[PDB]
Design a protein around this ligand. Structure first.
Ligand SMILES: [Cl-]
Ligand SMILES: [Cl-]
Length: 226
């Protein structure tokens, strides 16, 4: 029973070994709290052998706001003693321009995953960065709200089905600001915040069975570290 290491030993302990397959892990926080950095690191980590904290897997990265950085991936990979070429090849990138496209990409994801399912290097990670931004900007005023929840609930149900069918970890980011409220399902929720300079603090939010707590981690050349 394998898990995906975050690159941080303290964060992994908080998560029971790392982020799980057949589950939706959400990281939520303000802008600059390291949600995208954690997503980039996991996209590299998944490719690693189990002994190095990975699952010899492929990753898919759905980018809704234009935050994906292939150069950052090359940097993380090189700093972890890996081929930069192979890392970029093993991260399937999809730029989502609206909520409809974002939802459709979850079927496209299914198609590419069923094909690699029984192979040596299957998909093991799906990143949605960020899960709710398109739902927040598109459904304007009352009268758009019932449909906004209907669409979001359907999108999360598609992600859950995908995680269970293909034994993949679904890692999602969500910008929750101190000052819109988009209720949705997640297996695990983690609150992220700054942070003593480059230090980030992670807190488990109503995690079932896992003991309550916090983990401190850094944003380095290696992505995420203790
Ligand atoms: Cl393959
Ligand atoms: Cl909603």
């Amino acid at each position: 029973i394998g898990r995906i290491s975050t690159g941080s030993k303290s964060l992994d302990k908080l998560l029971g070994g790392g982020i799980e397959t057949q589950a939706i892990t959400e990281v939520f926080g303000e802008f600059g709290s390291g949600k995208t950095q954690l997503a980039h690191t996991l996209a590299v980590m998944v490719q690693l052998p189990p002994e190095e904290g990975g699952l010899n897997g492929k990753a898919m990265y759905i980018d809704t706001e234009g935050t994906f950085r292939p150069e950052r991936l090359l940097e993380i990979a090189q700093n972890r003693g890996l081929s930069g070429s192979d890392v970029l090849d093993n991260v399937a990138y999809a730029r989502a321009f609206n909520s409809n496209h974002q939802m459709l990409l979850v079927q496209q994801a299914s198609d590419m995953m069923v094909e690699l399912l029984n192979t040596d290097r299957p998909y093991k990670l799906l990143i949605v960065d960020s899960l709710t931004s398109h739902f927040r900007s598109e459904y304007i005023g009352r009268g758009a709200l019932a449909e906004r929840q209907q669409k979001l609930a359907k999108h999360l149900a598609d992600l859950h089905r995908l995680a269970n069918l293909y034994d993949i970890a679904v890692f999602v980011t969500n910008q929750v600001q101190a000052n819109h409220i988009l209720a949705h399902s997640a297996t695990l929720r983690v609150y992220l915040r700054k942070g003593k300079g480059g230090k980030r603090i992670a807190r488990l939010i109503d995690a079932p069975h896992l003991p309550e707590g916090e983990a401190v981690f850094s944003i380095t050349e290696k992505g995420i570290e203790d």
